[PDB]
Design a protein around this ligand. Structure first.
Ligand SMILES: Nc1ncnc2c1ncn2[C@@H]1O[C@H](COP(=O)(O)OP(=O)(O)OC[C@@H](O)[C@@H](O)[C@@H](O)CO)[C@@H](O)[C@H]1O
Ligand SMILES: [Zn+2]
Length: 262
């Protein structure tokens, strides 16, 4: 019984629904079915699942990834030495490592359909990403501190690895402290160091802490660029491309000014 795309979606939804206590009339349209799969994956605490599920999940998500408009590193025109600036979706970029602005529990996002980068990454990667992270935290015996990095396989993403970092959060209407700056610096440093240790050719950062974490976007960009330039000026590294993956026009305009205003 080889399965077509729709049968794979049905199988995945039904497997996860059978695990849940709640009853949900199965949706009809493609948006409703796909969004249900993502919701159920989002909510699923780590627990053993069938080799069959994971096989089918991988086929489905891998096929979804292949059918996106993907970007290779060599496709990116806008570079300043090893630094690249690129606006787009990090789940469609075939960098060796992408950086996830993760939470301190590191299991991804359990809020269904939440468009934080953590949810988006886990949703495209597969449930193995949450599982790998669960193991790491279990063994660590504790929540992940801000300003660190853990690397995992990227699974069904077009990248090879996900580097998970937890950034500083700025409370509504409060200024950034020196400690806040040092924490964000540390996230950039820790990701660059880990990807360098793993002998990677490329890493793509998201704009850490500038979404829901309210880090002022000019200030964050200045830190990110300074930390990356200091790192390249001070270290031998396998890294040949450090990609600033921006998601908003506002971030693009900021990074463009800072990198190419010269
Ligand atoms: N597909 C995409 N590709 C590239 N960039 C994307 C993206 N989707 C969103 N972004 C951008 O990712 C950055 C981090 O935002 P986010 O709001 O995801 O992240 P942060 O502001 O760093 O806040 C951290 C929280 O999300 C975190 O602690 C947890 O609670 C998670 O569960 C912002 O610049 C977003 O616009
Ligand atoms: Zn979220």
């Amino acid at each position: 019984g080889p399965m077509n795309n729709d049968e794979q979606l049905e199988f995945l939804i039904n497997y996860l629904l059978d695990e849940r206590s709640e009853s949900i009339d199965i949706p009809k349209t493609f948006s409703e079915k796909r969004n249900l799969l993502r919701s159920l994956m989002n909510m699923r605490h780590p627990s053993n699942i069938s080799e069959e599920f994971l096989r089918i999940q991988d086929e489905f998500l891998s096929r979804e990834t292949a059918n996106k408009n993907l970007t290779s590193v060599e496709d990116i025109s806008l570079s300043s030495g090893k630094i690249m600036l690129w606006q787009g979706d990090i789940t469609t970029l075939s960098a060796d490592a992408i950086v996830n602005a993760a939470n301190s529990k590191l299991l991804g996002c359990f809020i269904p359909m939440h468009n934080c980068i953590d949810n988006i990454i886990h949703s495209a990667s597969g449930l193995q990403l949450r599982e790998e992270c669960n193991r790491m935290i279990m063994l660590q015996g504790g929540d992940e501190d801000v300003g660190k990095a853990k690397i995992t396989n990227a699974y069904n993403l077009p990248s090879k690895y996900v580097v998970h970092t937890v950034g500083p959060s700025i409370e509504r209407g409060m200024r950034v402290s020196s400690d806040d700056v040092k924490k964000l610096e540390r996230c950039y440093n820790s990701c660059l160091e880990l990807a360098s240790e793993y002998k990677l050719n490329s890493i793509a950062f998201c704009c850490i802490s500038t979404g829901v974490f309210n880090f002022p976007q000019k200030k964050a960009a200045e830190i990110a660029i300074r930390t990356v330039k200091d790192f390249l000026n001070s270290n031998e590294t396998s890294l040949n491309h450090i990609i600033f993956d921006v998601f908003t026009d506002k971030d693009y305009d900021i990074y463009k000014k800072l990198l190419f205003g010269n």
